[PDB]
Amino acid sequence: ELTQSRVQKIWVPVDHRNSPTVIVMVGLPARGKTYISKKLTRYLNWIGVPTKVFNVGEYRREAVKQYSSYNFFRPDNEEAMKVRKQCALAALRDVKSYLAKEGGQIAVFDATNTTRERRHMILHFAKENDFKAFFIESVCDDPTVVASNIMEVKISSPDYKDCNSAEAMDDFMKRISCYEASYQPLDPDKCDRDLSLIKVIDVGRRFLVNRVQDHIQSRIVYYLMNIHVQPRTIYLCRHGENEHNLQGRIGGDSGLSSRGKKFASALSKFVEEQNLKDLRVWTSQLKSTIQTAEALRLPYEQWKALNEIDAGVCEELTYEEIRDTYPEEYALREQDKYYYRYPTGESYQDLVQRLEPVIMELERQENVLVICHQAVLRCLLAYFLDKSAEEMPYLKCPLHTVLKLTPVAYGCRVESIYLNVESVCTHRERS
Amino acid sequence: ELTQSRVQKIWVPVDHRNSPTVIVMVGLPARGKTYISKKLTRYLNWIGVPTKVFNVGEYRREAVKQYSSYNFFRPDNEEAMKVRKQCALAALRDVKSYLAKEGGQIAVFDATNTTRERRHMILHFAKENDFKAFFIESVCDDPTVVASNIMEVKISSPDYKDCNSAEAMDDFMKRISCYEASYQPLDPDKCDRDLSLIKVIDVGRRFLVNRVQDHIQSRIVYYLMNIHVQPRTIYLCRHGENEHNLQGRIGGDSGLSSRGKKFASALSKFVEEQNLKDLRVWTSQLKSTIQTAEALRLPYEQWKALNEIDAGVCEELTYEEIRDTYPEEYALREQDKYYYRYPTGESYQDLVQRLEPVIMELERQENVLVICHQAVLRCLLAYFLDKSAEEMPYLKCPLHTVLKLTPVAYGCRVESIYLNVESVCTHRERS
Ligand SMILES: Nc1ncnc2c1ncn2[C@@H]1O[C@H](COP(=O)(O)OP(=O)(O)CP(=O)(O)O)[C@@H](O)[C@H]1O
Ligand SMILES: Nc1ncnc2c1ncn2[C@@H]1O[C@H](COP(=O)(O)OP(=O)(O)CP(=O)(O)O)[C@@H](O)[C@H]1O
Ligand SMILES: O=P(O)(O)OC[C@H]1O[C@](O)(CO)[C@@H](O)[C@@H]1O
Ligand SMILES: O=P(O)(O)OC[C@H]1O[C@](O)(CO)[C@@H](O)[C@@H]1O
Ligand SMILES: O=P(O)(O)OC[C@H]1O[C@](O)(CO)[C@@H](O)[C@@H]1O
Ligand SMILES: O=P(O)(O)OC[C@H]1O[C@](O)(CO)[C@@H](O)[C@@H]1O
Ligand SMILES: [Mg+2]
Ligand SMILES: [Mg+2]
Structure with missing residues (x-):
């Protein structure tokens, strides 16, 4: 019982x-x-x-x-x-x-x-x-x-x-x-x-x-x-805009949009002008991050741990649809975005446990470019910038923007770099 | 592309x-x-x-x-x-x-x-x-x-x-x-x-x-x-029989059947007659394993990593249904059960990566009782008994049976112990 x-x-x-x-x-x-x-x-x-x-x-x-x-x-x-x-x-x-x-x-x-x-x-x-x-x-x-x-x-x-x-x-x-x-x-x-x-x-x-x-x-x-x-740099960014982004649908495994690809092209120019002796590229196993990495013409590695959070029975849905279809659930999430777990899906807490191996490997590596997803990116960023579990699920990690993290003093320095390419906005505050 | x-x-x-x-x-x-x-x-x-x-x-x-x-x-x-x-x-x-x-x-x-x-x-x-x-x-x-x-x-x-x-x-x-x-x-x-x-x-x-x-x-x-x-013992077993087992449906999160509970009761008697000074109990986060552990009246710990393999879009389905609904998929799995991954789901390979932390912790602990699921149990067993990835997805791990693993010489000794309680059979060979 x-x-x-x-x-x-x-x-x-x-x-x-x-x-x-x-x-x-x-x-x-x-x-x-x-x-x-x-x-x-x-x-x-x-x-x-x-x-x-x-x-x-x-x-x-x-x-x-x-x-x-x-x-x-x-x-x-x-x-x-x-x-x-x-x-x-x-x-x-x-x-x-x-x-x-x-x-x-x-x-x-x-x-x-x-x-x-x-x-x-x-x-x-x-x-x-x-x-x-x-x-x-x-x-x-x-x-x-x-x-x-x-x-x-x-x-x-x-x-x-x-x-x-x-x-x-x-x-x-x-x-x-x-x-x-x-x-x-x-x-x-x-x-x-x-x-x-x-x-x-x-x-x-x-x-x-x-x-x-x-x-x-x-x-x-x-x-x-x-x-x-040893001095090194860690760049973090999401996949180029994708079909689901345009439709405002969460989860899924869609491909880059015309803009998304444009962004992927800009990212290539960015990496190029960084003049890095070496650079590792990591993506998730979802199509959009891989398509993006491909545009760099650099060898990359796929991590299933980097896949976007699993929305469970809400995958492929739009927030509007969720709000209507699973109202009670839509509310339980807004009141506790970190611990809330989607039915048969995950929570931000689950992502952290899932990303531990990624973090441990980033500490071992030198220069690394990680192309991932919104929620996933928040998690990692929360680690490098020491952000509480309360603020993690709300950090702003916009599309087409490269976060450049560099070691300084006792922590990490962050620099935002928008690659100048339009895209929808998938960010949403508490309400 | x-x-x-x-x-x-x-x-x-x-x-x-x-x-x-x-x-x-x-x-x-x-x-x-x-x-x-x-x-x-x-x-x-x-x-x-x-x-x-x-x-x-x-x-x-x-x-x-x-x-x-x-x-x-x-x-x-x-x-x-x-x-x-x-x-x-x-x-x-x-x-x-x-x-x-x-x-x-x-x-x-x-x-x-x-x-x-x-x-x-x-x-x-x-x-x-x-x-x-x-x-x-x-x-x-x-x-x-x-x-x-x-x-x-x-x-x-x-x-x-x-x-x-x-x-x-x-x-x-x-x-x-x-x-x-x-x-x-x-x-x-x-x-x-x-x-x-x-x-x-x-x-x-x-x-x-x-x-x-x-x-x-x-x-x-x-x-x-x-x-x-140090000498210690590791017991492995699945959750007591559950509703889905009876209907022959995979995945899902159903509860114990009348027999399943009976088994849970027998397990208690078993642990009791083992005369262990200490014993840790680990379960998954699915209902059936927890209900089983509850019958022991011993403090236990839940691991999301121990949840049964994710069947993806096939969850809740019966093999018959899969065979008919997703024929091509049903075939791709029989020809490569280890690497095959369910649409939006996992593969046995994914389970191994997901269970690594469990294995590492089992090596650190003394006596541990792990109540899990069929595929999950195969994975762990494959580790202790050194079974190739080819045979892992087919090892026989029946319901209501306790596998008693003990350290001996260079490897692990295994003892099967059926707690004498009927249940359906969820095992299926290659065909
Ligand atoms: N294992 C280690 N050995 C030597 N230097 C290290 C180190 N780990 C970090 N550092 C370097 O030490 C600096 C930070 O030193 P920190 O202030 O922590 O020293 P401290 O706490 O020993 C001094 P104090 O007791 O005087 O405050 C950074 O430059 C950092 O890169
Ligand atoms: N770090 C360690 N230190 C000492 N004994 C250990 C050990 N790890 C394991 N053992 C014990 O050693 C035994 C196995 O020894 P093993 O045969 O591997 O030794 P060996 O390979 O050194 C000998 P040889 O070169 O004579 O074949 C087991 O009893 C095991 O519990
Ligand atoms: O972290 P949030 O605000 O719940 O948004 C999560 C969603 O963001 C997305 O990356 C879409 O932008 C989805 O894949 C994911 O489910
Ligand atoms: O820990 P101890 O032995 O009291 O030394 C403490 C002192 O060391 C310092 O870090 C200086 O090295 C001071 O900031 C601190 O007051
Ligand atoms: O390992 P197999 O042969 O694919 O069976 C896996 C299925 O077994 C079950 O534990 C049911 O017995 C399901 O939860 C799981 O999807
Ligand atoms: O590695 P070495 O220096 O050639 O010693 C090898 C010998 O050690 C042994 O393990 C005996 O201790 C033998 O089985 C083996 O032939
Ligand atoms: Mg100091
Ligand atoms: Mg030897």
């Missing part, structure tokens, strides 16, 4: 009457601890695992109004040490409220945590709140890398609002020397034999993994081994 | 007119090199990557008729060394024919390869045939583990056909001591800095990964970190 939920179409038994994890970042400054923290979090939240970053740096920038210099981080700075410890403890406080009282699942503790003492303290914290502890250490003693990092995300930090490169660059170098003496890296073969951890070496050149307590830690591990930092 | 293939329903441009990899196993005997090789291969072939194992041991057992003793593996055994080298070279010969002439993609070289010399030779081989080289080393100096391994897959080997445990166990111990002196493990921080490799330590307790050249090596890495060897 079960009843099927109206929105998610899930069968639940009629009533009629996974321990949370604390990810601990470890490493000297300018080692990508925050970079990793944010990206990790962006991913986890995307695939549905509620994650939040707790940057002890911000707690510090909060308590000590405006920034001083490296003197603040001197081991002999008795007062700063007091404040820094109170920052770490305040953050763990907020962590407890997240994992135990706010429904959070993973809490990333973003700090240097370069001493066994500090780590043992966190372990204790976890041990008493019934939380698992997974460590991620970033080791890299390459002056070129450290130097480059200092330039990319430090010299512009709010701490150096009143500094130039020459001085900021020096203050941070001294800042790093502060942690160096007492820095005790993880020792998975001795003192840290029992800790579950992954040590990222030379920006992913080598990894040392210890244990792994569950699938969640398993994924995280997989992810870090696939992301990289 | 494209045309859609009739079987796979894929759009291809009308005509009208990934370097192969050699996986190198490394390690002393009784370290699971062959275990890993077979499992790795079983998996890769399942997800579509043509892989083959080249056990240098078999080449040896082939050339030297019947087995001697550990004297054969003595470093001072000038003649044996000659034969052993000719075996390794003959196997690489067959590797070349596989990766370059037989359409193979991955070739697992199963040997001790415990010396830098031997390894350099293989590198050279790869370097000249344009093959990538990925190494997997298994290090474990635990006497209990080594001892146990010697018992589980050595003492019964065809080499010891005329030996008892007491003597076989001793001959293998001496055999191991032979390789020990010249054994040079991988050194990812010195001599082997440039080699792409994964070093499995203490049966997966710790890993040291170096590089990783592509996604294929990325997956392999992920897999090894998720499989384990």
